[PDB]
C-alpha cells in the first residue's frame, strides 16, 4: 500500500544501492522508478517491490508525466538463445556511449524536466534525493520509521 | 482420487463442496434488540452476597 506513485523510496540492492528515487508507476510486479537523472543520476529502471523502502517523505507530483509507455517490452533485453557470449569488445559495446537510443534519451530528459518543478517547490528535496541513504552506528532499522 | 487432503476450514471451495449451507449461514444475528431486561432476584443477590 505504501508504494504509491510519486513516493520517494530507497534502493536496497543493485548498483544503485542507497540511492533515493521517485516512483513513477506501478508495473505488474516491479516499480518503474527513477530519481531525477539530473539530481542523483539514476535512469528509468524497474525495481522489484521487495528491494525498496517507501519513505514517509512528501510525495512528488507525477501526474503530469505519461507512464503508459514504460512496459515490460520497453525494458526487455535482447534475445540470445545461444551459450556463446562475453568479450572485451562486448564490454566496449553497450555502455552509456553506445546503444542507449536517442528515444530513451528524450524520455529520460522529458520526465526529468517534468519532475524538477515539484522537487524545487518542496524545499530540501533536491539535496535529499541527491544524497545516499546509509546506516550509522546505533541505528536500529526495526525502530526507525522511514 | 483424493491425492491431497484439502482442509475445508482453510479452503472455501472444499467447504462449499462438503457443506451446501455455508452460502447462507448468517452467524452474527442481533438477538437482544437493544433492550436487555436485567433479571436477578433479590433473594439471589442476598444469597450471593451472604457472609
Amino acid at each position: 500500500a505504501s508504494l504509491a506513485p510519486g513516493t520517494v523510496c530507497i534502493l536496497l540492492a543493485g548498483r544503485f544501492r542507497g540511492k533515493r528515487v521517485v516512483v513513477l508507476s506501478q508495473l505488474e510486479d516491479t516499480l518503474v522508478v527513477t530519481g531525477p537523472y539530473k539530481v542523483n543520476g539514476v535512469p528509468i529502471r524497474r525495481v522489484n517491490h521487495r528491494y525498496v523502502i517507501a519513505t514517509s517523505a512528501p510525495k512528488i507530483d507525477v501526474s503530469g508525466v505519461s507512464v503508459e509507455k514504460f512496459t515490460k517490452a520497453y525494458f526487455a533485453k535482447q534475445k540470445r538463445s545461444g551459450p556463446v557470449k562475453k568479450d572485451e569488445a562486448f564490454f566496449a559495446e553497450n555502455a552509456p556511449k553506445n546503444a542507449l537510443p536517442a528515444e530513451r534519451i528524450a524520455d529520460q530528459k522529458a520526465v526529468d524536466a517534468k519532475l524538477l518543478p515539484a522537487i524545487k517547490a518542496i524545499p530540501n528535496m533536491k539535496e535529499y534525493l541527491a544524497a545516499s541513504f546509509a546506516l550509522s552506528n546505533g541505528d536500529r532499522p526495526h525502530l526507525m520509521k522511514f | 482420487a483424493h491425492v491431497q487432503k484439502k482442509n475445508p476450514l482453510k479452503n472455501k471451495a472444499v467447504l462449499s463442496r462438503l457443506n451446501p449451507y455455508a452460502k447462507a449461514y448468517k452467524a452474527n444475528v442481533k438477538i437482544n434488540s437493544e433492550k436487555t431486561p436485567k433479571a436477578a432476584g433479590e433473594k439471589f443477590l442476598s444469597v450471593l452476597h451472604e457472609n
Binding site: - | 483424493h2 487432503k5 475445508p8 462438503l18 447462507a24 433479571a39 432476584g41
Partner: protein, 214 residues
C-alpha cells in the same frame, strides 16, 4: 445424462435444508437453556443444566508401562496411541470404564465447534477397514447412507446430539490422530486435572485442549 445431475441437485438442496434445521436446533436449545437459567435466577430457584451425554476422550500417556486392565480398556476405547481422540456416550457403563483409565486419558464435554472442527480438519472414515478422509459426502453416503446419514453435517448432528445411530457413526469415524498441543501441557502432565495436572475429567476444558491440538 442429465437425470443424475437433476436428482443430485435436489439431493444437495435436501442436505442444505437438513443442515439448516440442525443449526436451528442448536440455537434453539442453547437459547432455551439460557432463558431457563435466567428465569430460575430471577425467581430465586436453581435450575441444573442437563448432564452431558457426549464425551470426548483423549489419550495422554504413551504405550509403555501400563497395567493389563487399563491397557485392555484403552484398546476397547480405540485409544491405542498418545494424543488420540474419540467421541463416546456417557452412561453408567462408560463412566466406570473411564474411571479405571483416569490416569491415562483426559475427557470432557465437547462443544459444537470442537465436534465440527474435529470432523472437518481431522475427519477420517473407516471405509472397508481403511482410513479414508471425509473429503466428499459420497464417502459417508456409501458407509452410513442406510442410517439416514447423508452428509458431513448430518454426521456432526448425530455425534453432537447423540442420535439413535451414535454407535455406528462413532465406529465409522476413525479415531482422531491429534497433534501435540501448541503452547504445551501444564508443568506436570501426569497428575490429575484437579491437582494442576492434565489427566482425568476436565469438564469443558477439553475444548481449550482440542483447540490447541488442532
Amino acid at each position: 445424462a442429465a437425470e443424475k445431475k437433476s436428482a443430485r441437485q435436489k439431493k444437495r438442496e435436501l442436505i442444505a435444508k437438513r443442515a439448516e434445521a440442525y443449526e436451528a436446533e442448536y440455537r434453539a436449545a442453547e437459547r432455551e437453556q439460557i432463558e431457563l437459567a435466567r428465569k430460575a435466577r430471577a425467581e430465586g430457584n436453581y435450575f441444573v443444566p442437563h448432564e452431558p451425554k457426549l464425551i470426548f476422550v483423549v489419550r495422554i500417556r504413551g504405550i509403555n508401562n501400563i497395567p493389563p486392565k487399563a491397557r485392555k480398556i484403552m484398546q476397547l476405547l480405540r485409544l491405542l496411541q498418545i494424543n488420540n481422540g474419540i467421541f463416546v456416550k456417557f452412561n453408567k457403563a462408560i463412566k466406570e470404564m473411564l474411571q479405571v483409565v483416569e490416569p491415562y486419558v483426559t475427557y470432557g464435554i465437547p462443544n459444537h465447534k470442537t465436534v465440527r472442527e474435529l470432523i472437518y480438519k481431522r475427519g477420517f472414515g473407516k471405509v472397508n477397514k481403511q482410513r479414508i478422509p471425509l473429503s466428499d459426502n459420497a464417502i459417508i453416503e456409501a458407509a452410513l447412507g442406510k442410517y439416514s446419514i447423508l452428509s458431513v453435517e448430518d454426521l456432526i448432528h448425530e455425534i453432537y446430539t447423540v442420535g439413535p445411530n451414535f454407535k455406528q457413526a462413532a465406529n465409522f469415524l476413525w479415531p482422531f490422530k491429534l497433534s501435540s498441543p501448541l503452547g504445551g501441557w501444564r508443568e506436570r502432565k501426569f497428575k490429575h486435572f484437579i491437582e494442576g495436572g492434565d489427566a482425568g475429567k476436565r469438564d469443558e476444558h477439553i475444548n481449550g485442549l482440542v483447540q490447541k491440538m488442532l
